[PDB]
Amino acid sequence: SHPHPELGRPPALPKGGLRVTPLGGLGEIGRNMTVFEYGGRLLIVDCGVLFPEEEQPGIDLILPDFTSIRDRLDDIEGIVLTHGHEDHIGGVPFLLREKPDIPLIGSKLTLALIEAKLQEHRIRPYTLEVAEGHRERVGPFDCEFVAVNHSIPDALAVAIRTPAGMVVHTGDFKMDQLPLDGRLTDLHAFARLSEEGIDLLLADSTNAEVPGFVPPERDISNVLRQVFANARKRIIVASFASHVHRIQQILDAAHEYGRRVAFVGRSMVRNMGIARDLGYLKVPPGLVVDVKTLDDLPDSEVVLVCTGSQGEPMAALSRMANRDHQIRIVNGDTVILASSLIPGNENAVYRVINGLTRWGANVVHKGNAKVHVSGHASAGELLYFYNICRPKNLMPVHGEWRHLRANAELGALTGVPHDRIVIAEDGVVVDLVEGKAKITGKVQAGYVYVDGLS
RNA sequence: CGCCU
Ligand SMILES: [Zn+2]
Ligand SMILES: [Zn+2]
């Protein structure tokens, strides 16, 4: 059920066939990168980083291994970026460093985030801004973009038409039926595509073991309002700097309860700056202020929105927990971790929670309140989605082995034949020839470490 | 299930 221990290098790609090679994101969540080959030309979908398991000096970021494309960088027609999360765009500066003029293709918000990051590397990319419904030809790859709801706005899936057929890549997605911006995962589009014929579907496996459905994001508002309604002093809320809709709900609550909001921490100030500037984050006049003014306000009128929900030791929340921040936690402070607890950050996160608790804060988190919902489709949604797409072949992506296997089982339950479901690992080469996907070889795909200079 | 600075 797993790829053969000694697959060799793949054979020549038959004329009229398509080659699909995940270089990252399989067997380990992160550094997502998938290479598509047709007629000697390459299309890359996503290029992320992976964060190490507690690894000390010498190791900051982990990259996909570019060895299999490095001697044919001139064949790359473009890099499609499904959405602006670091495990999908973090690797881009390191790829462009080897060939700077590879066009970036993505939504407005996605491009604003990757351009912000690139500016620090002194790199100005060529870009093609796309939106849902746009269809564009990139060399031999005919690309159509489809809206998907996720935990960051402006995420996209892509359908890639070649003479080998149509491949659909979901990116990361779920299916919130009441999204804050009204932007649904576009099931009409997926239905139409399925009637044309989806020959190969690559689908997000992150939440495939979780039965049932993701609760809508907007339900978090009720919990926030309760917490705000009952907080008598300062409120401090930590979230990922990219979760615009979560932060939106925080501002709405603050507004409702007569509080003002300051953003704290480099990432948060930067991203919320961009979201507000471009209109993804809706901010009423008078609500957001500079943190320096909060001293002059009564505690009961204060909300700090800050960074460090994963216990990152340099982020704001951890420094506050360790008495090493401008903001000093006092008895009666309310702290909300409006976030997931990513498997493996448990020790860091609990260390922060315990620190905060020691200084007398009331700490609200997903363990004692519903202040977070997953950004990825659950088993129930995946069944809906497969019943709509009816793919002729299925490749689960974006998951550890337990995730990929569970996703494959869901596919099988909806009627995808078992011989048309392929579970790949990083570096495994899959060929779509005459409508059928088969594993045909493997390339080098180990870990590559980087200190900013690699 | 994506950082943070
Ligand atoms: Zn992801
Ligand atoms: Zn994501």
Numbering used by the authors: 2 to 455
Report text from the authors:
The ribonuclease RNase J is a key enzyme in RNA turnover and precursor processing in the model Gram-positive bacterium Bacillus subtilis and numerous other bacterial and archaeal species (1–9). Thus, in addition to the eponymous β-lactamase fold, RNase J bears C-terminal and β-CASP domains. RNase J can cleave mRNA by either endonucleolytic or exonucleolytic mode, with preference depending on the 5′ end of the RNA.
The structure reveals a homotetrameric quaternary organization that unexpectedly carries intact nucleotides of RNA at each of the active sites. This pre-cleavage structure, solved at 2.27 Å resolution, provides details of the interactions of the RNA with the catalytic site, including a network of water molecules which may facilitate acid-base chemistry. In the course of preparing the recombinant S. coelicolor RNase J, RNA originating from the E. coli expression host was found to co-purify with the enzyme. The RNA was also sequenced and identified as 5′ pCGCCU, but the remaining 3′ nucleotides could not be identified unambiguously. The 5-nucleotide sequence fitted well into the experimental electron density in the substrate-binding tunnel that encompasses the active site, but the electron density was not clearly defined for the remaining nucleotides to the 3′ end of the experimentally identified pCGCCU sequence. The RNA interacts with both the metals through the O1 and O2 oxygens of the penultimate phosphate of the 5′ terminus. The water forms a close contact to the phosphate ester oxygen (2.7 Å). It was unexpected that the RNA would be found in the catalytic site adjacent to a water molecule that is apparently ‘activated’ by Zn binding, and yet not be cleaved. The reason that the S. coelicolor RNase J/RNA complex is stalled appears to be related to the presence of 1.33 mM EDTA in the crystallization condition, because we observe that EDTA inhibits the activity of the enzyme in this concentration range. Close inspection of the active site shows that the scissile phosphate is not properly aligned with the potentially attacking water molecule to permit a bimolecular nucleophilic (SN2) attack.
